[PDB]
């Protein structure tokens, strides 16, 4: 209620501080880091890289990240706890399902999925006792039949616990509209939902249609850009819009009166096995600041564009605390 | 060379004894049993069910099973070792990839996949030190581009180590023909390959085309039948051919001179989360003998049809030892 669950236990709302609401320690697949740690060099190399990156983010002002890696994105909460302790940065873990559920998940009913999400929120993840503080869901265009069940189960789990829901979208296909429709059919308040990857589109009619009915808007991939990259795989993933173009959507929604509904993040990672080999090297070339990109480069950019510091503090501190605090 | 790796260490060829070459302790997905053990009631309930089933198979004469669950079928070698110790039945574990690889596998090259398979054969699975004694691969119709890489990587891993390859097929689509073509393009001897689920078809021209060029023929789902089952999901999985019809394919290949190339098994499981809920209950209703079905019902059936006991001993003891013994 007045506590947010992290990988090291409950924290008070004021302890969260400056919070990045959509990040990843390691974007992988279930069991993959355990079965093939050499893919990342070594598990120890991955830990060290993440600790260094989180320590640099902390020096830039970050106090909490929300790791929105699910079961099928290879979430390893023991890894998150280790890196969180070493870097002195709170990490909120996720339940839910992302874009790669295995058969043992894809065959389940809405009731079964709700049981699984509630397990990870209310009891713990695996045998770790670590509880999720957010529910992550995904569509990539029109929802599959199974994805409709996932979104409904996420709504039921959030209605039982007060934990918020955050989504992956194909933003240029306006996925958030169908996601909202399904969420609302289950009775979920839009104030409990962040429609993510919304900085992937420039369509203000789509974005304000979501914000007008009360959704939080996840402008969460600000440094994702392949401008300057011959590299087909990187351009497909990162897009050809500049980080400045994405960042100006923050100002656009402020100027329309939605400052309390904006969540900002990097959607960064320290390991990334669910895409092409060496993508992490390419991404780190594009954005050497990693997760510190938001405070080091986006915040000063918005200040120079005239956004008051108080407004940016509200977006990076107040909005995440309101979102993450469990409530109906 | 003269040792077969099991989940409890190396065993001599003569220790293997009566061997079921295609079985599963638990057909699941990577990480699923760890994240949601209540799906199986409890992990302890699954262990007890498997120990009881393996003890009954041992009483019927079974000494070894080959668990052909891969990474993506949720293979948990620690579970296999626990059940193997409690039941006093050797268990050979598998590497490879089955029909549900996650993104972190599906994006890999043939070289990367070969590294992963060799890791599990030569070094160990996860951090357990348990080494795989077989490589499992799968197609379901025409091979996907990725499945072609998997079959090539399996061939390269087998060529480096002498460990055999065993396959999942859509037998009525004659998948074994393309699998053989890819294997042979990499230089793999057919004597190192079992084309599995071959009892799913009655096409003798397909089966003898594989056997004539030297492949082992996996007649591995003998008790799979939905005769007597209204139940659409079970009929889709188990088929409408009787176990006697499947078993008579053993006699057919003996009568054509291929007795040394036949491998027989149940393709049974004690847990099964990668299909519809409660499928395990339906399967256990169909075949209460479980993994003991081959010795308790198929062997006497073939004897009554005139197959000499020496021939059946060759199929159930000699052929698996020759297949599993590492060699080029
Ligand atoms: C940049 C990434 O990595 C995986 C998670 C994602 O969907 O947010 O996309
Ligand atoms: C009966 C089953 O379970 C999963 C493995 C399979 O492909 O052999 O099919
Ligand atoms: Zn995403
Ligand atoms: Zn993400
Ligand atoms: Zn199979
Ligand atoms: Zn099988």
Description of the molecule:
With 328 residues, chain A is an alpha/beta fold. Chain A has one domain: Alpha-Beta Barrel (TIM Barrel), CATH 3.20.20. Chain A contains 14 helices and 13 strands. Chain A has helices at 13-16, 32-35, 43-59, 77-87, 103-106, 110-123, 145-161, 175-185, 204-212, 232-238, 243-255, 279-286, 293-304, 309-324, and strands at 3-6, 9-12, 19-23, 26-27, 64-67, 90-92, 94-96, 134-138, 165-168, 193-195, 216-219, 262-264, 271-272. In chain A, the strands form four sheets. In chain A, strands 7-8-9-10-11-12 form a six-stranded parallel β-sheet. A three-stranded parallel β-sheet of chain A has the order 3-5-6. In chain A, α9 (204-212) links the parallel β10 and β11 (216-219). The longest helix of chain A has 17 residues, at 43-59. The relative contact order of chain A is 0.15. At the A-B interface, α2, α5 and α6 of A face α2, α5 and α6 of B. The complex binds 2-methylidene-1,3-dioxane-4,4-diol (2 copies) and zinc ion (4 copies). Chains A, B: Zn(2+) 2 binds at residues 136, 168, 197.
Task: Label this structure with key terms.
14% strand, 328 residues, AryldialkylPase_Zn-BS (chains A, B), binds 2-methylidene-1,3-dioxane-4,4-diol, Metal_Hydrolase (chains A, B), membrane (chains A, B), binds zinc ion, TIM Barrel, 14 helices, homodimer, six-stranded parallel beta sheet, hydrolase (chains A, B), zinc (chains A, B), alpha/beta, three-stranded parallel beta sheet
Number of strands of chain A: 13
- What proportion of the residues of chain A is helical, as a percent range? 40-55%
Total domain modules of chain A: 1
- Structure classification of chain A: alpha/beta
Work out the helix count of chain A: 14
CATH domain class name of chain A:
Alpha Beta
Q: Estimate the strand proportion of chain A.
A: 5-15%
CATH superfamily of chain A: Metal-dependent hydrolases
What strand line-up does the widest sheet of chain A have? 7-8-9-10-11-12
Query: Which pair of chains forms the biggest interface, and how many residues does each contribute?
Result: A-B, 35 and 35 residues
- Please give the CATH architecture of chain A: Alpha-Beta Barrel
Bound molecules: 2-methylidene-1,3-dioxane-4,4-diol, zinc ion
> Could you give the distance between the termini of chain A?
10 Å
List SSEs of chain A in N-to-C order. Answer: EEHEEHHEHEEHHEHEHEHEHHEEHHH
Give a short account of the largest sheet of chain A: 6 strands, parallel
The value of Rg of chain A in angstroms is: 18 Å
Shape summary of chain A = globular
CATH topology of chain A: TIM Barrel
- Multimeric state of these chains? homodimer
PDB class: hydrolase
Keywords: hydrolase
Assembly: dimeric
Entry title: The impact of molecular variants, crystallization conditions and space group on structure-ligand complexes: A case study on Bacterial Phosphotriesterase Variants and complexes
